[PDB]
Amino acid sequence: MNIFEMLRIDEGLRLKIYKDTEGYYTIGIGHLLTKSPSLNAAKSELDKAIGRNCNGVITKDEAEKLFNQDVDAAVRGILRNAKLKSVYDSLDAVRRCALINMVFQMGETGVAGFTNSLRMLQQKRWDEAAVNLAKSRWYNQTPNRAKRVITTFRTGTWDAYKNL
């Protein structure tokens, strides 16, 4: 199991514009297009992102390309943020996947906001951090996905996805 397969399970693949759990316009493997309410504004972002007139629809290939770029940017964003890089560097390979997943879903800024939980991961207090991470809007809004990420940090194994 690797970051790509992990994120593909959590986000799904959709070749037509769609609204995400938060109601935002998305396409592919979790690629947010705009927080704007206009399907029009979305179709324009989409065409800008792909480099063609898509009319709201893309091919598998295009989805995977956006996915590659987004995971790359998620990693680069962690490495560029001091708070984040320091946790990332302290972690083992599996747990590293878990922090990347959070960053991909909620952006650098958002994850950097989990001050206390980051401190615990850094200290390697797995159970404590799992409990603290569960006290968040994130967990209340998308609980099955959050639990899978949480378990990953708690155990350091891919058990939560070996199901799926």
Curated annotation (Swiss-Prot):
Query: In UniProt terms, what is the effect of altering G30F?
Result: Almost complete loss of enzymatic activity. The enzyme is destabilized by 1.5 kcal/mol
Which Pfam families did the record assign?
Answer: Phage_lysozyme
Give the UniProt subcellular location, in the record's own words: Host cytoplasm
Under Gene3D superfamilies, the record lists: 1.10.530.40
The broad enzyme category this protein falls into is hydrolase
The effect annotated for D20C is:
Nearly no effet on specific enzymatic activity
Q: Which biological processes are named by the entry's GO terms?
A: cell wall macromolecule catabolic process; defense response to bacterium; peptidoglycan catabolic process; viral release from host cell by cytolysis
Q: Which UniProt keywords apply?
A: Antimicrobial, Bacteriolytic enzyme, Cytolysis, Glycosidase, Host cell lysis by virus, Host cytoplasm, Hydrolase, Viral release from host cell
The residues listed in the UniProt record as binding substrate, with positions renumbered to this chain, are L32, F104, S117, N132
- UniProt effect for mutating D20 to A/N/S/T: Complete loss of enzymatic activity
Summarize induction of expression: Expressed late in the viral replication.
Cellular component terms (Gene Ontology): host cell cytoplasm
Question: Tell me, what does this protein do in biology?
Answer: Endolysin with lysozyme activity that degrades host peptidoglycans and participates with the holin and spanin proteins in the sequential events which lead to the programmed host cell lysis releasing the mature viral particles. Once the holin has permeabilized the host cell membrane, the endolysin can reach the periplasm and break down the peptidoglycan layer.
Entry's family note: Belongs to the glycosyl hydrolase 24 family.
Protein name (record): Endolysin
Specify the species.
Enterobacteria phage T4
